Enzyme design. Structure first.
Site, PDB file in Angstrom:
ATOM      1  CD  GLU A  32       0.972 -12.611  -3.095  1.00  0.00           C
ATOM      2  OE1 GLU A  32       0.677 -12.370  -4.164  1.00  0.00           O
ATOM      3  OE2 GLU A  32       0.380 -13.514  -2.411  1.00  0.00           O
ATOM      4  NE  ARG A  47      -2.847 -11.488  -6.692  1.00  0.00           N
ATOM      5  CZ  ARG A  47      -3.752 -12.543  -6.262  1.00  0.00           C
ATOM      6  NH1 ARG A  47      -3.489 -13.837  -5.567  1.00  0.00           N
ATOM      7  NH2 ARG A  47      -4.863 -12.641  -6.464  1.00  0.00           N
ATOM      8  CG  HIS A  94       0.660 -11.708   2.011  1.00  0.00           C
ATOM      9  ND1 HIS A  94      -0.585 -12.041   2.073  1.00  0.00           N
ATOM     10  CD2 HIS A  94       1.362 -12.530   1.203  1.00  0.00           C
ATOM     11  CE1 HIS A  94      -0.936 -12.481   1.033  1.00  0.00           C
ATOM     12  NE2 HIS A  94       0.246 -13.093   0.288  1.00  0.00           N
TER      13      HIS A  94
END
Ligand SMILES: Nc1nc2c(ncn2[C@@H]2O[C@H](COP(=O)(O)O)[C@@H](OP(=O)(O)O)[C@H]2O)c(=O)[nH]1
Length: 104
Positions: free
Chosen positions: A58, A77, A40
């Site tokens: 992300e 991440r 997303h």
């Protein structure tokens, strides 16, 4: 040495490669996975001065070596963009709220 460090989560760039790559193929197919459904868009609410040009995305990187395959995002991440260029390695670990700090 580990190409990127998020607190105590040491990760070689190779690791980094196989995370964003993965997450970009799912981004290609337009498919979404997860409670918090990754991948997303990552809007840059923090605003790190990145080399890469938005729109950014992300996608979770696990310290165990495997790829995100639903479930647990953990906390670290990888953020790619539309032309699979790497924008960075950000992490909850060490910042406050739902912040992210770049991984040294
Ligand atoms: N910290 C942070 N979280 C983001 C960013 N972009 C998305 N998220 C998180 O992912 C969630 C799912 O992606 P979303 O942004 O498409 O809804 C977001 O809901 P929020 O939009 O309310 O922030 C947010 O909580 C960003 O730039 N920074």
């Amino acid at each position: 040495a580990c190409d990127y460090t998020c607190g105590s989560n040491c990760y070689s760039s190779s690791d980094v490669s196989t995370a964003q790559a993965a997450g970009y193929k799912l981004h290609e197919d337009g498919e979404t996975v997860g409670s918090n459904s990754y991948p997303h868009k990552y809007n840059n609410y923090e605003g790190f001065d990145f080399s890469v040009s938005s729109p950014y995305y992300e996608w979770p990187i696990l310290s165990s070596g495997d790829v995100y395959s639903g479930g647990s995002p953990g906390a670290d991440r990888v953020v790619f963009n539309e032309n699979n260029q790497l924008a960075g390695v950000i992490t909850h670990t060490g910042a406050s709220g739902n912040n992210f700090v770049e991984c040294t």
